Subunit: 314 residues, 5 copies
């Protein structure tokens, strides 16, 4: 019996990539072709039915199986549908879809993470013994040209047909609760320019500003105090505002570690100033070797750490 | 008489956990099976009906009872439906649902709180004398593996069949106003890493920054003035911003008490500086035993308080 | 003639209290019972019709009057409906509703205000000469426990049946433009803990910090300058963020008067410091009775004002 | 031939005034009465049809013209409808509507601007040669007695019936493309209390704080430096946050000019301090006539500017 | 064969231009006229059908093709529809639409960028061999006068009728997979007043404030320290808040480069002050030629940079 269904999915665009809710909107077309009883259309050309007569056609016994996306969040926005009825028997169901899909994303390497936009299509009411997906072909011609998003599409699409077992139908369908599933995966990487400008360069210049304190002698303590407190508060607000752009994930990201290292450098600069002020105890000059060596240690350590960082993750 | 209805609920995913509105979105499938009068299916195969033919079947007298979720917020997003009609009489209703459900949450131990995601399913128009839930089986196979939400699910779901009394039917149905109710409960705990990084570490480093003032002698008043005002304003902004992620609840949370203790420490450090400034009335220094002992009292008290706090709530 | 209709409203929950839009969401059930012409049910048992046959039944001449909420914002989300048809003629319409209702709210005593949640139900197309509300019974069993979500429910519900005249039907229906209206009112008060923690305690501690300036002599001008400018800016931002939680109503609230008094206290402290700095020369030396008396006048005045304030409104 | 249609519009409430999108939500009732061919009602009483039978009535040839709001944003929320059918032929269509309407607003005098809430009703598919609006009666009894939510209603509503030509139907119907249009206009003014408290009083007190620097001698420069930089930064953030509540327009508002003048005053105070500090070089405590005359020039100039401003626009 | 379809698009308004999501809402009317088989209308006058009979007419064999927008995001909000049926055979489909359309936008020249609002209309189910677009006419009479809502319309609308090939229909339609497409493009430029007031004037005045430091001698290190740190932090927050109004695009905009140059100037001023402080040796006046030349170089370089900048991009 099992009806062989050939599926072709045209992807018009991907957008609305919300990393907080871990959703992304997909606009495209879906074509589902199977082979039924032969028919006689007016002329050799096949007959075309637009959405509403479709009801009547399935009310008079025409078999049109309902397909459903698993990753969708809420009923996907279904546009116009159409039925092409061929004289040689093949029936084709074509519909436009606008859907908010979901997929598990891992942000450990954020903002250098690699993710996948996934479509999991699956028939309803019909198991693999009744309906089986023969082939799948994805035509991603629109987005593959330029990868227009805050993301970058890396490579062609991947297709896979699998069989998924549901235990909640075993109470009904005995030993017949396996459904055929089409899986479409699109690999993508994150472009870091926005994140550079918004968090990395601010942290770098904040560390530089903190280091500027070293090139003052055991001078007006308020000046270096202003440096220290200003820089530590700036780094705190930067860490908060940077992690506000991610979901509340127990694990730490690469941006988290970078911010932590910059925070440690700024706090170490402040503690160094406090230390060298604790050792002044005198109305003499005696410029301190501590600051003279810090003026080199801090920038050189920051530079080699940045080299290690950016050599990693890239 | 009472029609025994067997229910199986497959939960595809839980997401959209909004602690402000105390809602959470649940996507899954629902199966409701009962045994009616025998019928004649076409062929030996049981009959399958997809949503629209369903109308015709309920127009020709087929009895399909309406079930409803109590925790839902608005009409739940209903996907595709299906009826499996068996020759031996049993009818089976299978449908996908995506709903925003509600449940009373208690935030006294926030962010260490433990909550439960609840589904309250119940028939409409039919009491326990007409329709009764025989058994319930929940299949939470997808999410129980790794908990990739902002929460952590601990264990399988709990099922409960109960009888609920309604006073708004007591005005008509005397002593016959009891409805069968299925309740599915999923226990969850909150991951605190986001809250750690966003409020606790900032508060801790702000307390450290406030304590740094002790390591300046009593002469430069402005430096320690900047320290005190900077730290108290930072702690105020942190107190404000921390409760921004919670509903407006009259009661206090654990994070509230932690912030209050940190604020007390910062303000007490500032008042200590003001006190040692009150003894400046001289042209002498006499480095103050107050600061010399504070450099130990403040950090040690903060450390033992952190020990007590983090030993509690965990 | 006038058909007597008995109405019972079961309130499942009240939530979504948006003080900005002056709206609130109510989820519950509505029951409307009247006595019509007798009918012949299959068997002695009364007949039950679930939503869809309902259409068919009114297509065969069944008279089902349309009821409407006046306070509602948009078409309320109606869940499942049901008709209980008795052989003796009485009809019962039971349906679940979830609606966003509106009511004029007065925020003069904010955040100590007391408000009312109102439901104004009224028939459509039928006047008091055709349809009359006989009795009303509200069954608020779920929420009566002094529920959560920023408010406190004080007492049971109040019911009132009235007659409202419409001038826009006078152009057609002469002397027949009076409609019967059911009004359900639920008194509620606001929990102030959130508002305390978010604005009052910050303002109080800001005033305390501003007063701390007095315990510095008139010598270090910058320290007290930092105190004054920091505190006045803090109070300005606090006033802004405090009125950010209210609609643009133009009248003054209790929070407005409290913030204004705290602002006056902070600015008066700054002005006192500026005056004594203009008097650091021209007639004083190193100690001033002005500060010695301010250290008592400012805290005592603030305390007695706080006593008067908090004794009021409570 | 042309069907004379009598229209009566009851306005229940106006709310949701979003100045950013220049929209406003209007809830009310609409009545449209015309005189058609006589019919046979059951009994002498006229017939009443509630929405759903309405379909059947328009399915058997009853002529019900479609009306449309032009200013509406999206399909307006249509509640319950009703048809009153008289035996002498006259038909009456009554329906509740809730719509988000739009109207061109000019914000040059903001926040002292005067705007108009407009309803543009117009038939669809039928020109003035087939359907003509005879008269209009607006019954704004509910809301006109009081304020709205943030605005003030000045006077009753104004009505106008006009004829509008559409060029996109000129391609088909030659010289018969004129449509009758009903226009309802309600004048409104903006309440300024919120804007006063949120921007005007903050700017005024910021100018006062900036002027406080003058009452410090050419003493420790950091204090007056703190004054200047604090005040200029405060005025910058205030200007930004003030224009954040308006759409991104090209012209300047009254609030813009007020903030600009305050900014000029603050920056001039800072520049004055910088100038007198370039002349502070001396070893005497000589107080400068520049500051002594500024202590009068700046407050008096600000006061006369405030007088001119508030005398204008009011 | 190919049915020539004439299309006319009336644009009522364009609004809701969200640059973050790169969407814009378009409300208007659409008219599609073709020539079918002659019919007999009641009288010689054409027949008019209002939405609901439309169903019936397509149920009795009337051919009404479904058209679809490609740039739309989700199912467009369709208002009222209408069919004008002429006796000479021509059919006209007229409907009001309100849709959120999308178009690829390039923000490299932001905020001086030039963009285009695009509508791509295209038939469904019918290729160029079955349905062909004969002509297209856009009537943008209402909105073309104002150029309102943060943009400026430059010129009338442009049309392009093309044939687009779909490779995902080659599996079904061999050599018959070309669809006729109407493309309407409206060129527009961005109004910069809002962006001027919100970022440019703040950055310019911040550069001025930073330069003010030169007019203080090298005596009070803290005053110029406050100047430097305040100005660099202000520029950092301004850059962040400025890019907060844009999508996360890997490339840099003109506003980005302006902010970068202002940041470089401010940081260079601070570094210059630190250098001149490193020359504090020679405890006699020794005022430094560095400041004497900076007081001219910094303002003159900033002025010539502003001249080059604003002469470009304009």
């Amino acid at each position: 019996r099992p009806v062989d269904v050939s599926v072709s999915i045209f992807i018009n665009k991907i957008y609305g990539v919300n990393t907080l809710e871990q959703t992304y909107k997909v606009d495209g077309y879906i074509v589902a072709q199977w082979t039924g009883k032969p028919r006689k259309t007016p002329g050799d050309k096949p007959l075309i039915v637009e959405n509403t007569q479709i009801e009547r056609w399935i009310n008079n016994g025409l078999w049109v199986p309902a397909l459903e996306f698993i990753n969708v969040v809420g009923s996907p926005d279904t546009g116009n549908k159409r039925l092409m009825l061929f004289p040689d028997g093949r029936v084709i169901y074509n519909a436009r879809f606008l859907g908010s899909f979901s997929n598990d994303m891992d942000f450990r390497l954020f903002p250098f993470d690699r993710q996948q936009f996934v479509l999991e299509l699956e028939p309803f009411s019909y198991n693999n013994q009744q309906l089986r997906f023969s082939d799948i072909q994805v035509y991603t011609e629109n987005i593959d040209n330029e990868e227009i998003d805050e993301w970058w599409i890396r490579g062609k699409a991947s297709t896979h047909i699998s069989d998924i077992r549901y235990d909640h139908l075993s109470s009904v369908q005995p030993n017949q609760n396996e459904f055929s599933r089409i899986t479409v995966r699109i690999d993508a990487v994150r472009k870091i320019g926005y994140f550079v400008i918004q968090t990395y360069l601010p942290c770098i210049m904040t560390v530089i500003l903190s280091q500027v304190s070293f090139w003052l002698n055991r001078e007006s303590v308020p000046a270096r105090t202003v440096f220290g407190v200003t820089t530590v508060l700036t780094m705190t607000t930067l860490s908060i505002s940077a992690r506000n752009s991610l979901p509340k994930v127990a694990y730490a990201t690469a941006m988290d570690w970078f911010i932590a290292v910059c925070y440690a450098f700024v706090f170490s600069a402040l503690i160094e100033f406090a230390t060298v002020n604790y050792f002044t105890k005198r109305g003499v000059e005696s410029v301190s070797k501590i600051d003279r060596l810090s003026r080199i240690a801090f920038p050189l350590l920051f530079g080699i750490f940045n080299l290690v960082y950016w050599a990693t993750y890239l």
